[PDB]
Amino acid sequence: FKHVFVCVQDRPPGHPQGSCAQRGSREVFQAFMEKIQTDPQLFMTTVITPTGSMNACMMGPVVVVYPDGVWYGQVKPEDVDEIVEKHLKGGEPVERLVISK
């Protein structure tokens, strides 16, 4: 079982740190949601949850995988397949995107 949290926080334009939504995270969330179901094996063992800010805004879009405790930053919609294949199914975090373990 893995639980994926995607920050979908939006903020007004003046917020100095911006927001994950401004950096494309709603499309990241959408991508995870489309994979996890179009994909039987993901669907049965993975939950994808949208969140408010997880306070790492300038490194966004922020995606956290539990119980592993892997924090990703700068995630693009195009990166979701790699995260799904390598990490969620293959158990290997995508090192290039990790900001914290």
Interacting residues toward ligand FES by CB under 6 A = 7, 9, 19-20, 53-57, 60, 62
Which is it for strands 70-72 and 63-66: parallel, antiparallel or unpaired? antiparallel
Please return the burial class of 13, using the count of CB atoms within 10 Å of its CB with bins 0-12, 13-18 and 19+: exposed
CB of 52 to a copy of itself, least distance (A): 4
Going 53 to 51 to 79 to 90, the CA torsion angle's sign is: positive
Contact residue for a copy of itself among 54, 59, 94, 99 (CB under 8 A)? 54
Compute how many residues bind a copy of itself; rule: CB under 8 A.
17
Query: Is residue 55 a contact residue for a copy of itself (CB under 8 A)?
Result: yes
